[PDB]
Amino acid sequence: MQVWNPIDNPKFETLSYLPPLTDNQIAREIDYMLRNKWIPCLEFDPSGTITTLPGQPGYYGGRYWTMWKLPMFGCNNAGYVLREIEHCKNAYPGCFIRVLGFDNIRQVQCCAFIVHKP
Amino acid sequence: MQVWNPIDNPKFETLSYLPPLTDNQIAREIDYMLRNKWIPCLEFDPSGTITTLPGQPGYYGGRYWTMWKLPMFGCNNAGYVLREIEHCKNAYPGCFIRVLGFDNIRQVQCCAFIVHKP
Amino acid sequence: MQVWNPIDNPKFETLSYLPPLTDNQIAREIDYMLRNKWIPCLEFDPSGTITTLPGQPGYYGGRYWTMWKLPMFGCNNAGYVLREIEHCKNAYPGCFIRVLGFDNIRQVQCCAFIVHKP
Amino acid sequence: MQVWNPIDNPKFETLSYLPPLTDNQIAREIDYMLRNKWIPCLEFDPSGTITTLPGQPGYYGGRYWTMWKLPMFGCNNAGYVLREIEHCKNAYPGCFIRVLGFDNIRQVQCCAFIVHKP
């Protein structure tokens, strides 16, 4: 029998229950988005809390982050996405950073995972 | 004439107005729960405050604590409950700890008292 | 022309716009309450702020203080009220203190002023 | 491509997106108010934040400041407005300061800009 820790144990959605992610395993999730013709993007924010309202169902605060430059339309190689992450983290070394993708035919995001923590 | 102190004087429900509890007087409240065929349990939480809501009668926040492992079904000797409290005290030396009992025929708790303070 | 200061300038109701009160001028407001057959009392509290509620007219929080021992029924000399203030000042040297009076025929207070500040 | 900074970048309404203001171009915005027959005034406050209410459209908190002495009725030279700003700066060296103007025929303010920051 073992006990799960309730104090100071935050989580960050998908892939947060596995061992930490290495640099190889990161450029295998981008070649899967490129093989299906999706569009990469980047974001950053200094905090991650959630706020509500008294009597309004389905309203939450803290779901929008700030966009780095613009979506990378017409991209074929995975060596540019990896270089943009390094430019992002040299200017803001005290924020979180997250990677997304875009399906343009169904208009919905397809991926999300964290690559940097403060 | 004497004056009761209003500053920094919290209380913790049953048995809090008596002198502090010794190790002998603790293993006399367990032999009374065992003589009536009840089931022991343990809990712990870092805080103890209470919160309310504007216009909802009978709603309070801060009434659930975290359970240690599981209720001790089929227990006859009082030397195991005393050993589990010591295992609980080494993992979390900065929390409160409470002892409970269960009546399975009327479905209601039967006792509660505090054994450790931060 | 001169300017009235808006920063860090609290006030405490009646008699608070006059120069500070000396020990002589304090035992002249008690002989005026005793000449009309009223009953002295004492109070103390650590804070002095006021709160409200969203949509309830005439509700304010922070209007009750704590009472020292009991009202002084049947008191004729002013040397006891002055001695009780000194007993109150040694037990709680970090609170405010107020002096009250009671009219028992119209059931309403008649006086109030501050004698000690933290 | 360049990125606009989202962290710790407050703004103060009109003329805040231009380079900082020198002493020459502070005595050119007053001769424009004097040529149209308007009335100068001054203000100061220690903070600059805004607050709202749950369900009341068009209500905001933090829109009133404190007035220095009085509006300058019948003023023709711009050397008095410049001297009053210096008297205001020695008494309260930890507040913001604003300059206003008044049109008495349409009853509406005509300008506002900041001249001192903490």
Side-chain angles (χ1 to χ4, degrees), chain A residues 1-59:
Chain A
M1 249 165 182
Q2 272 155 253
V3 189
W4 195 248
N5 182 340
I7 302 119
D8 287 343
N9 205 350
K11 289 274 195 279
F12 296 94
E13 277 293 344
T14 305
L15 292 201
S16 338
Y17 281 71
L18 295 184
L21 226 37
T22 86
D23 262 321
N24 203 24
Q25 313 184 29
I26 279 179
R28 326 273 74 201
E29 311 258 317
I30 279 152
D31 319 71
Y32 182 78
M33 143 170 41
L34 286 208
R35 262 190 315 243
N36 292 253
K37 283 96 163 33
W38 296 334
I39 305 128
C41 207
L42 279 153
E43 289 191 323
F44 61 93
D45 209 70
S47 93
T49 74
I50 300 263
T51 320
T52 65
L53 265 196
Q56 297 282 338
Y59 176 83

XYZ file of all heavy atoms in Angstrom, chain A residues 1-59:
481
model
N 0.825 -1.199 0.000
C 0.000 0.000 0.000
C 0.862 1.254 0.000
O 1.839 1.347 0.739
C -0.938 0.001 1.209
C -2.406 -0.187 0.865
S -3.394 -0.600 2.312
C -5.013 -0.801 1.581
N 0.494 2.219 -0.837
C 1.210 3.481 -0.934
C 0.201 4.614 -1.039
O -0.952 4.405 -1.425
C 2.167 3.492 -2.130
C 3.539 2.930 -1.813
C 4.246 2.385 -3.035
O 4.374 1.174 -3.203
N 4.718 3.280 -3.894
N 0.645 5.818 -0.684
C -0.222 6.985 -0.576
C 0.182 8.018 -1.620
O 1.368 8.320 -1.786
C -0.170 7.585 0.842
C -1.229 8.657 1.004
C -0.368 6.495 1.871
N -0.814 8.555 -2.319
C -0.618 9.586 -3.327
C -0.548 10.959 -2.666
O -1.325 11.265 -1.758
C -1.757 9.524 -4.351
C -1.525 10.267 -5.632
C -2.176 11.387 -6.053
C -0.590 9.934 -6.665
N -1.701 11.777 -7.281
C -0.725 10.903 -7.677
C 0.354 8.916 -6.828
C 0.042 10.881 -8.835
C 1.116 8.898 -7.977
C 0.957 9.873 -8.966
N 0.390 11.781 -3.123
C 0.696 13.038 -2.441
C -0.343 14.101 -2.788
O -0.561 14.386 -3.970
C 2.097 13.501 -2.842
C 2.539 14.781 -2.139
O 1.733 15.553 -1.629
N 3.846 15.009 -2.124
N -0.993 14.717 -1.794
C -1.939 15.801 -2.076
C -1.386 17.219 -2.011
O -2.119 18.150 -2.371
C -2.989 15.595 -0.980
C -2.176 15.140 0.177
C -1.120 14.237 -0.407
N -0.142 17.426 -1.584
C 0.394 18.763 -1.331
C 1.411 19.116 -2.409
O 2.367 18.366 -2.642
C 1.021 18.869 0.067
C -0.004 18.528 1.147
C 1.566 20.259 0.295
C 0.373 17.350 1.993
N 1.200 20.263 -3.062
C 2.129 20.848 -4.033
C 2.464 19.874 -5.165
O 3.625 19.554 -5.422
C 3.406 21.335 -3.341
C 3.187 22.599 -2.536
O 2.162 23.277 -2.759
O 4.042 22.918 -1.681
N 1.422 19.415 -5.853
C 1.559 18.447 -6.940
C 0.683 18.861 -8.120
O -0.370 18.263 -8.369
C 1.199 17.045 -6.445
C 1.848 15.955 -7.258
O 2.422 16.208 -8.314
N 1.766 14.727 -6.765
N 1.084 19.890 -8.862
C 0.296 20.325 -10.019
C 0.549 19.455 -11.242
O 1.560 18.760 -11.351
C 0.784 21.758 -10.265
C 1.657 22.100 -9.081
C 2.205 20.804 -8.610
N -0.388 19.526 -12.186
C -0.299 18.761 -13.421
C -0.680 19.656 -14.594
O -1.348 20.677 -14.426
C -1.189 17.514 -13.371
C -0.676 16.445 -12.424
C 0.341 15.543 -13.099
C 0.588 14.283 -12.293
N 1.545 14.507 -11.180
N -0.248 19.263 -15.793
C -0.335 20.112 -16.982
C -0.897 19.347 -18.179
O -0.323 19.346 -19.269
C 1.029 20.713 -17.312
C 1.551 21.635 -16.252
C 2.391 21.167 -15.257
C 1.195 22.970 -16.243
C 2.861 22.014 -14.279
C 1.664 23.818 -15.265
C 2.497 23.338 -14.284
N -2.027 18.666 -17.974
C -2.815 18.044 -19.039
C -2.116 16.860 -19.696
O -1.532 16.019 -19.006
C -3.194 19.074 -20.106
C -4.429 19.899 -19.775
C -5.712 19.083 -19.748
O -5.726 17.949 -20.267
O -6.714 19.584 -19.201
N -2.189 16.781 -21.025
C -1.723 15.605 -21.751
C -0.234 15.364 -21.536
O 0.564 16.307 -21.509
C -2.016 15.759 -23.244
O -3.410 16.026 -23.437
C -1.647 14.494 -24.004
N 0.126 14.087 -21.369
C 1.501 13.595 -21.317
C 2.215 13.972 -20.025
O 3.436 13.828 -19.930
C 2.300 14.101 -22.522
C 1.930 13.558 -23.905
C 3.081 13.741 -24.874
C 1.516 12.098 -23.841
N 1.473 14.433 -19.021
C 2.065 14.852 -17.757
C 2.226 13.714 -16.760
O 2.856 13.912 -15.717
C 1.224 15.958 -17.120
O 0.436 16.606 -18.091
N 1.678 12.536 -17.048
C 1.768 11.397 -16.150
C 2.860 10.416 -16.554
O 3.031 9.391 -15.885
C 0.411 10.680 -16.077
C -0.596 11.369 -15.176
C -1.183 12.569 -15.550
C -0.965 10.814 -13.957
C -2.096 13.203 -14.735
C -1.881 11.441 -13.139
C -2.441 12.635 -13.533
O -3.353 13.268 -12.727
N 3.599 10.700 -17.613
C 4.719 9.909 -18.093
C 6.029 10.486 -17.571
O 6.057 11.579 -17.000
C 4.718 9.885 -19.625
C 3.564 9.214 -20.373
C 3.838 9.246 -21.863
C 3.346 7.789 -19.903
N 7.144 9.774 -17.738
C 8.431 10.351 -17.361
C 8.739 11.570 -18.205
O 8.168 11.752 -19.296
C 9.422 9.209 -17.630
C 8.613 7.988 -17.519
C 7.266 8.341 -18.056
N 9.636 12.450 -17.731
C 9.922 13.694 -18.463
C 10.357 13.467 -19.902
O 10.849 12.391 -20.252
C 11.044 14.329 -17.633
C 10.804 13.822 -16.261
C 10.349 12.403 -16.444
N 10.183 14.483 -20.741
C 10.366 14.367 -22.180
C 11.767 14.808 -22.581
O 12.240 15.868 -22.160
C 9.323 15.207 -22.920
C 8.600 14.548 -24.093
C 8.333 13.085 -23.802
C 7.306 15.283 -24.383
N 12.422 13.992 -23.402
C 13.761 14.272 -23.892
C 13.685 14.998 -25.233
O 12.617 15.163 -25.823
C 14.573 12.982 -24.016
O 14.319 12.373 -25.286
C 14.203 12.008 -22.914
N 14.845 15.437 -25.721
C 14.909 16.185 -26.969
C 14.622 15.333 -28.194
O 14.162 15.870 -29.208
C 16.284 16.842 -27.125
C 16.282 18.296 -26.703
O 15.290 18.998 -26.993
O 17.273 18.739 -26.085
N 14.899 14.030 -28.137
C 14.552 13.157 -29.251
C 13.045 12.968 -29.354
O 12.477 13.082 -30.441
C 15.243 11.803 -29.100
C 15.383 11.075 -30.421
O 15.395 11.693 -31.484
N 15.479 9.754 -30.360
N 12.383 12.700 -28.228
C 10.956 12.398 -28.225
C 10.110 13.618 -28.560
O 8.907 13.491 -28.804
C 10.526 11.839 -26.868
C 11.422 10.750 -26.324
C 10.893 10.162 -25.033
O 9.688 10.138 -24.800
N 11.796 9.690 -24.186
N 10.713 14.802 -28.559
C 10.011 16.008 -28.974
C 9.922 16.148 -30.487
O 8.852 16.521 -30.995
C 10.649 17.269 -28.354
C 10.160 17.452 -26.920
C 10.315 18.507 -29.164
C 10.747 18.647 -26.225
N 10.975 15.839 -31.235
C 10.933 15.867 -32.691
C 10.541 14.488 -33.212
O 11.197 13.913 -34.080
C 12.277 16.318 -33.254
N 9.457 13.951 -32.650
C 8.732 12.813 -33.206
C 7.242 13.111 -33.156
O 6.450 12.478 -33.859
C 9.036 11.512 -32.456
C 10.451 11.365 -31.922
C 11.396 10.760 -32.959
N 11.755 11.684 -34.029
C 12.217 11.310 -35.215
N 12.397 10.035 -35.516
N 12.494 12.239 -36.126
N 6.857 14.068 -32.313
C 5.492 14.568 -32.267
C 5.252 15.692 -33.262
O 4.099 16.076 -33.476
C 5.153 15.058 -30.856
C 5.502 14.075 -29.758
C 4.291 13.322 -29.245
O 3.239 13.961 -29.044
O 4.391 12.093 -29.044
N 6.310 16.224 -33.868
C 6.162 17.236 -34.903
C 6.079 16.601 -36.290
O 5.307 17.065 -37.137
C 7.317 18.248 -34.807
C 7.028 19.266 -33.705
C 7.541 18.961 -36.126
C 8.264 19.843 -33.074
N 6.838 15.535 -36.535
C 6.744 14.785 -37.779
C 5.422 14.051 -37.928
O 5.074 13.661 -39.045
C 7.898 13.787 -37.888
C 9.211 14.365 -37.416
O 9.368 14.572 -36.196
O 10.085 14.617 -38.269
N 4.685 13.846 -36.840
C 3.341 13.294 -36.913
C 2.295 14.333 -37.271
O 1.327 14.007 -37.960
C 2.959 12.637 -35.580
C 1.589 11.999 -35.574
C 1.374 10.767 -36.175
C 0.510 12.626 -34.965
C 0.126 10.180 -36.171
C -0.741 12.048 -34.960
C -0.926 10.824 -35.563
O -2.171 10.243 -35.560
N 2.469 15.573 -36.818
C 1.604 16.669 -37.230
C 1.883 17.101 -38.665
O 0.955 17.476 -39.388
C 1.768 17.841 -36.260
C 1.708 19.216 -36.894
S 1.624 20.546 -35.682
C 2.779 19.970 -34.442
N 3.144 17.046 -39.095
C 3.478 17.399 -40.470
C 2.968 16.370 -41.473
O 2.615 16.734 -42.599
C 4.991 17.566 -40.619
C 5.636 18.821 -40.027
C 6.880 19.189 -40.801
C 4.665 19.985 -40.007
N 2.928 15.091 -41.091
C 2.459 14.046 -41.996
C 0.966 14.143 -42.279
O 0.493 13.548 -43.252
C 2.786 12.669 -41.420
C 4.046 12.042 -41.988
C 4.189 10.583 -41.575
N 3.914 10.370 -40.158
C 4.801 9.924 -39.278
N 6.045 9.650 -39.631
N 4.431 9.750 -38.013
N 0.214 14.867 -41.452
C -1.218 15.048 -41.640
C -1.572 16.447 -42.125
O -2.755 16.799 -42.157
C -1.963 14.744 -40.339
C -1.904 13.279 -39.959
O -2.890 12.556 -40.076
N -0.750 12.837 -39.485
N -0.576 17.255 -42.497
C -0.781 18.599 -43.039
C -1.500 19.510 -42.039
O -2.630 19.948 -42.257
C -1.543 18.537 -44.367
C -0.704 18.105 -45.550
C -0.853 16.617 -45.802
C -0.380 16.243 -47.193
N 0.754 17.097 -47.636
N -0.819 19.791 -40.933
C -1.294 20.726 -39.920
C -0.283 21.865 -39.772
O 0.805 21.833 -40.346
C -1.551 20.004 -38.594
C -2.652 18.981 -38.693
C -3.692 18.986 -39.576
C -2.821 17.808 -37.887
N -4.494 17.893 -39.372
C -3.981 17.154 -38.341
C -2.101 17.247 -36.829
C -4.440 15.968 -37.771
C -2.558 16.069 -36.267
C -3.714 15.442 -36.740
N -0.655 22.883 -39.002
C 0.054 24.157 -38.966
C 0.568 24.419 -37.553
O -0.230 24.543 -36.621
C -0.844 25.311 -39.442
C -1.400 25.005 -40.833
C -0.083 26.615 -39.455
C -2.897 25.145 -40.952
N 1.883 24.519 -37.344
C 2.409 24.735 -35.986
C 2.238 26.169 -35.496
O 2.094 27.105 -36.284
C 3.894 24.376 -36.126
C 3.971 23.551 -37.374
C 2.952 24.146 -38.281
N 2.279 26.331 -34.171
C 2.162 27.629 -33.515
C 2.760 27.533 -32.114
O 2.985 26.440 -31.594
C 0.701 28.091 -33.448
S 0.464 29.878 -33.391
N 3.011 28.693 -31.498
C 3.632 28.776 -30.179
C 2.930 29.818 -29.316
O 2.306 30.747 -29.829
C 5.122 29.125 -30.280
C 6.104 27.998 -30.597
C 7.320 28.547 -31.298
C 6.513 27.278 -29.332
N 3.044 29.656 -27.994
C 2.412 30.553 -27.030
C 3.262 30.639 -25.768
O 4.187 29.852 -25.567
C 1.001 30.090 -26.665
C -0.027 30.244 -27.754
C -1.428 30.012 -27.244
O -1.602 29.129 -26.381
O -2.352 30.717 -27.697
N 2.923 31.599 -24.906
C 3.597 31.765 -23.622
C 2.730 32.597 -22.682
O 2.003 33.485 -23.129
C 4.974 32.421 -23.794
C 4.930 33.793 -24.408
C 4.870 34.924 -23.615
C 4.966 33.952 -25.780
C 4.833 36.179 -24.182
C 4.932 35.204 -26.347
C 4.862 36.317 -25.550
N 2.821 32.311 -21.384
C 2.075 33.013 -20.347
C 2.816 32.860 -19.029
O 3.474 31.837 -18.813
C 0.648 32.467 -20.204
C -0.338 33.513 -19.713
O -0.646 34.453 -20.475
O -0.802 33.398 -18.561
N 2.733 33.847 -18.130
C 3.437 33.749 -16.843
C 2.726 32.987 -15.733
O 3.354 32.746 -14.695
C 3.605 35.223 -16.446
C 2.431 35.891 -17.047
C 2.227 35.211 -18.368
N 1.464 32.597 -15.903
C 0.721 31.929 -14.842
C -0.225 30.904 -15.455
O -0.409 30.847 -16.673
C -0.044 32.935 -13.982
O -1.368 33.103 -14.451
N -0.824 30.083 -14.592
C -1.700 29.022 -15.056
C -2.926 28.717 -14.212
O -3.398 27.577 -14.216
N -3.456 29.699 -13.488
C -4.596 29.456 -12.614
C -5.923 29.641 -13.355
O -5.981 30.162 -14.469
C -4.541 30.369 -11.390
O -4.900 31.703 -11.769
C -3.146 30.369 -10.793
N -7.004 29.208 -12.703
C -8.340 29.173 -13.288
C -9.311 29.854 -12.331
O -9.251 29.637 -11.117
C -8.784 27.721 -13.576
C -7.821 27.041 -14.560
C -10.212 27.681 -14.094
C -8.277 27.054 -16.007
N -10.210 30.675 -12.877
C -11.184 31.423 -12.093
C -12.573 31.228 -12.688
O -12.719 30.971 -13.884
C -10.833 32.919 -12.049
O -9.417 33.075 -11.904
C -11.521 33.601 -10.880
N -13.599 31.350 -11.842
C -14.982 31.081 -12.224
C -15.859 32.293 -11.923
O -15.379 33.349 -11.501
C -15.524 29.843 -11.499
O -15.585 30.101 -10.093
C -14.634 28.641 -11.747
N -17.165 32.130 -12.150
C -18.190 33.134 -11.888
C -19.335 32.498 -11.109
O -19.604 31.303 -11.275
C -18.721 33.736 -13.199
C -18.099 35.045 -13.697
C -18.976 35.689 -14.748
C -17.848 36.014 -12.562
N -20.032 33.270 -10.255
C -21.024 32.678 -9.343
C -22.070 31.768 -9.977
O -22.182 30.604 -9.581
C -21.700 33.907 -8.719
C -20.795 35.070 -8.991
C -19.648 34.628 -9.838
N -22.841 32.263 -10.940
C -23.961 31.487 -11.440
C -24.047 31.361 -12.946
O -25.147 31.339 -13.505
N -22.901 31.273 -13.617
C -22.843 31.158 -15.074
C -22.223 29.823 -15.460
O -20.997 29.650 -15.341
C -22.043 32.310 -15.676
C -22.650 33.683 -15.450
C -23.811 33.967 -16.379
O -23.933 33.360 -17.440
N -24.672 34.895 -15.983
N -23.014 28.851 -15.912
C -22.437 27.573 -16.343
C -21.506 27.743 -17.536
O -21.779 28.514 -18.457
C -23.669 26.737 -16.709
C -24.797 27.379 -15.980
C -24.485 28.835 -15.975
N -20.402 27.001 -17.514
C -19.504 26.946 -18.653
C -18.655 28.173 -18.898
O -18.239 28.399 -20.036
N -18.390 28.979 -17.874
C -17.504 30.131 -17.985
C -16.301 29.938 -17.076
O -16.460 29.700 -15.876
C -18.221 31.433 -17.626
C -17.304 32.636 -17.647
C -17.013 33.289 -18.836
C -16.717 33.110 -16.479
C -16.170 34.378 -18.862
C -15.871 34.198 -16.498
C -15.603 34.828 -17.692
O -14.764 35.913 -17.716
